[PDB]
């Protein structure tokens, strides 16, 4: 340690900026303070990071245990644990996958054991149409009308990647039904309580997203009408295509920034493709000292 400085946004405003962070030299107390900022301010922006892919993984390893993405076409060619979102060819070749995350989601919400912390290190940043949208789903839960809180009490949700699974090069010429069935086998839909208690803060989190949450079911396992999910998406801001809803936060960044966020509390989305500007980002996703929630 000696010079990491965390500047948290005041009051209830989301976010924090972190100056002087060096993952190779930060103390244990520095790391614990950064993690507390992540869980309470939700998004920590590390400033002035000039890191190789290997150094980025090393930074993630200070915060938790990295997990590689289960579909390897997303993986960086040198570092399996880095997920690459890219639409800039390198020597004419596609690296990673283009145009990822164009829907509201929490990362790995369709998997049984999601990690708690996402790290994004932007490489190529659109000049005009840059940033990622976020909604804090604990704050969104707290803002629901009381009767809507009651209606989801006791319920469970089903989450699946089936809508947004991306076709891979080796899928060409396969019948689509075989791919659909392979997705159901490899990544079956996962049931979770509709709300859970955040292990680090005690907040109640509404754990749903328009992109991955495919059904809601009662306290006894019987499917409820998806009109309930639509009303929850509506109330929490996930159906507002203008992105002006009060719950929505647009997180911008500049070169050298590195975003670290709470993947229990937040859902996120890419912006509309209103410009032809490219995006390249590297992502590391880490498990911290607790499961996503205590029922895992
Ligand atoms: C479906 C996405 C990948 C993609 O948007 O192409 N998975 C992100 C994640 O849930 O970690
Ligand atoms: O969830 C996905 O589709 C993968 C990409 C992603 O998580 C993101 O772009 O934020
Ligand atoms: Fe994502």
From Swiss-Prot:
Broad EC category: oxidoreductase
Effect on the protein of changing residue 130 to E: Decreased catalytic activity
EC number from the UniProt entry: 1.14.11.78
Record Gene3D superfamilies: Clavaminate synthase-like
Source superkingdom: Bacteria
Binding site for 2-oxoglutarate: 272
Pfam families named among the record's database cross-references: TauD (PF02668)
Binding site for Fe(2+): 105, 107, 268
MF GO annotations: dioxygenase activity; metal ion binding
InterPro entries with a match to the protein in the record: TauD-like_sf, TauD/TfdA-like, TfdA_dioxygenase
Reactions that this protein is recorded to catalyse: a (3R)-3-[(carboxymethyl)amino]fatty acid + 2 2-oxoglutarate + 2 O2 = a (3R)-3-isocyanyl-fatty acid + 2 succinate + 3 CO2 + 2 H2O; a (3R)-3-[(carboxymethyl)amino]fatty acid + 2-oxoglutarate + O2 = a (3R)-3-{[carboxy(hydroxy)methyl]amino}fatty acid + succinate + CO2; a (3R)-3-{[carboxy(hydroxy)methyl]amino}fatty acid + 2-oxoglutarate + O2 = a (3R)-3-isocyanyl-fatty acid + succinate + 2 CO2 + 2 H2O; (3R)-3-[(carboxymethyl)amino]butanoate + 2 2-oxoglutarate + 2 O2 = (3R)-3-isocyanylbutanoate + 2 succinate + 3 CO2 + 2 H2O
Binding site for (3R)-3-{[carboxy(hydroxy)methyl]amino}butanoate: 69, 74, 101, 108, 166, 283
Cofactor (UniProt): Fe(2+)
Keywords, alphabetical: Dioxygenase, Iron, Metal-binding, Oxidoreductase
Binding sites annotated in the UniProt record for (3R)-3-[(carboxymethyl)amino]butanoate: 69, 74, 101, 108, 166, 283
Function description: Involved in the biosynthesis of a unique class of isonitrile lipopeptides (INLPs). Catalyzes the conversion of (3R)-3-[(carboxymethyl)amino]fatty acids such as (3R)-3-[(carboxymethyl)amino]butanoate (CABA) to (3R)-3-isocyanylbutanoate (INBA) through an oxidative decarboxylation mechanism, thereby generating the isonitrile group of INLPs.
Membership in a protein family: Belongs to the TfdA dioxygenase family.
Anything else known: Isonitrile formation goes through two consecutive, but distinctive, 2-oxoglutarate-dpendent reactions catalyzed by this enzyme. In the first reaction, an Fe(IV)-oxo species is utilized to generate a (3R)-3-{[carboxy(hydroxy)methyl]amino}fatty acid. Then, its conversion into a (3R)-3-isocyanyl-fatty acid likely proceeds by decarboxylation-assisted desaturation. In PDB structures 6XO3 and 6XOJ, the 2-oxoglutarate seems to be in an off-site binding mode (overlapping with the substrate binding site), which is not the binding site required for the reaction to proceed. The latter seems to be inducible and requires His-272.
Protein's recorded name: (3R)-3-[(carboxymethyl)amino]fatty acid oxygenase/decarboxylase
């Amino acid at each position: 340690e000696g010079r990491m400085q965390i500047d948290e946004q005041p009051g209830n405003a989301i976010g924090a900026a972190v100056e002087g962070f060096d993952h190779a030299t930060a103390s244990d107390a520095d790391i614990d303070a950064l993690k507390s900022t992540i869980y309470t301010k939700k998004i920590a922006v590390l400033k002035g990071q000039d890191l190789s892919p290997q150094q980025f993984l090393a930074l993630g390893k200070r915060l938790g245990r990295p997990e590689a993405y289960y579909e390897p076409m997303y993986q960086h060619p040198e570092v399996t644990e880095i997920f690459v979102s890219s639409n800039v060819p390198e020597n004419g070749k596609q690296i990673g996958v283009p145009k990822t995350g164009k829907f509201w989601h929490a990362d790995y919400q369709f998997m049984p054991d999601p990690f708690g912390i996402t790290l994004i290190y932007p490489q190529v940043i659109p000049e005009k149409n840059r940033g990622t949208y976020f909604i804090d789903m604990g704050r969104a839960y707290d803002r629901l009308p009381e009767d809507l809180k009651k209606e989801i009490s006791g319920t469970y949700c089903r989450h699946s990647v089936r809508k947004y699974f991306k076709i891979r090069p080796h899928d060409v010429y396969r019948p689509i039904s075989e791919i659909i069935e392979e997705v159901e086998r490899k990544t079956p839909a996962v049931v979770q309580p509709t709300t859970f208690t955040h292990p680090m803060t005690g907040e109640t989190v509404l754990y749903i997203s328009e992109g991955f949450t495919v059904g809601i079911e009662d306290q006894d396992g019987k499917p409820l009408d998806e009109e309930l999910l639509k009303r929850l998406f509506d109330a929490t801001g996930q159906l507002d295509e203008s992105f002006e809803h009060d719950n929505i936060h647009l997180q911008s960044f500049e070169q050298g920034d590195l975003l670290v966020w709470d993947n229990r509390s937040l859902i996120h989305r890419a912006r509309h493709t209103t410009t032809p500007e490219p995006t390249v980002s590297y992502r590391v996703t880490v498990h911290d000292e607790r499961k996503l929630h205590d029922g895992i």
